């Protein structure tokens, strides 16, 4: 294994990763980031 700087949070009883990957990937490129999805009402 290798050490990687990444933040982990605890919710309920489960230890989960917390990712908001927008600076490492999807940055200074021509693609649209997902999770900016659209809805119709």
């Amino acid at each position: 294994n290798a050490r990687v700087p990444a933040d982990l949070v605890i919710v309920g009883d489960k230890l989960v990763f917390l990712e908001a990957l927008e600076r490492r990937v999807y940055q200074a490129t021509r693609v649209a980031y997902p999770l900016i999805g659209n809805i119709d009402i």
């Binding site: 999807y26 200074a28 490129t29 021509r30 693609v31 649209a32 980031y33 900016i36």
Partner: protein
């Protein structure tokens, strides 16, 4: 006369060190966009085009 000479020349030499900060404030005011217009463009459009 020479006392007034030296006392005057000292403040004249000090004035450049005193006014360089004025020139940086002038150029930084002439450069900076407003935050209310800089921050939504940096966020609300992802990339551009």
């Amino acid at each position: 006369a020479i006392q007034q000479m030296a006392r005057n020349l000292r403040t004249v030499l000090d004035s450049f060190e005193r006014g360089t900060a004025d020139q940086l404030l002038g150029v930084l005011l002439e450069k900076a966009p407003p935050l209310s217009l800089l921050s939504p463009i940096n966020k609300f459009q992802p990339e551009g085009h």
